[PDB]
Design a protein around this ligand. Structure first.
Ligand SMILES: [Cl-]
Ligand SMILES: [Cl-]
Ligand SMILES: [Cl-]
Length: 196
């Protein structure tokens, strides 16, 4: 199983299919796919856990990566059984997700808290509790609430995409701290990111 607060499972939230791959609600997929390429972790089909998943070495630590293929609001149907099967406690999980309550180009590491309205996190917290870590990738808010599906399922304009891409890149550089259990330092260094 996992061991303490060394991060050993990194989940990226999103929806499957080409039609959703560039949408804001796939920000977590972007981060995990980029992380997998950085470290040479193969993301392969994982039908048992309704996802795409991988396993490999990050900086001397055995780490698993998971992209649920459930659709966002059923993400727990992948995350929960996967984490349970591999005996990964919440404290060793990082979930990367889009965050409506933060600007494009803002990124933060958070431990605990609720779903903040995010329909993927909403499907996970009831089962494993809140005590996992989150990489909150700011995407902005559309203003109004009847309109959240339109914003998160949109493809950001180029300036906003560039801001998110820079924040994600910064966070990739801090995964070494996370897999080493240096959550406080990683939090400080991630949360200090500015785009310019
Ligand atoms: Cl959705
Ligand atoms: Cl935060
Ligand atoms: Cl969160």
């Amino acid at each position: 199983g996992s061991h303490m607060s060394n991060i050993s499972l990194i989940v990226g939230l999103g929806n499957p299919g080409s039609e959703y791959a560039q949408t804001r609600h796939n920000a977590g997929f972007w981060f995990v796919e980029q992380l997998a390429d950085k470290y040479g972790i193969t993301l392969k089909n994982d039908p048992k856990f309704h996802g795409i998943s991988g396993r490999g070495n990050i900086e001397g630590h055995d780490v698993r990566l998971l992209l649920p293929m459930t659709y966002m609001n059923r993400s727990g149907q992948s995350v929960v059984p996967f984490s349970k099967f591999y005996q990964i406690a919440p404290e060793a999980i990082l979930i990367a997700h889009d965050e409506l309550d933060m600007n494009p180009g803002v990124i933060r590491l958070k431990t605990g808290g609720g779903h903040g309205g995010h329909n993927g996190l909403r499907d996970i917290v009831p089962h494993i509790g809140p005590n996992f870590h989150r990489l909150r990738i700011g995407i902005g808010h559309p203003g109004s609430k009847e309109r959240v599906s339109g914003h998160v399922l949109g493809k950001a304009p180029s300036n906003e995409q560039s801001l998110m891409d820079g924040a994600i890149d910064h966070a990739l550089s801090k995964v070494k701290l996370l897999v080493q259990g240096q959550v406080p330092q990683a939090m400080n260094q991630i949360n200090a990111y500015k785009p310019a």
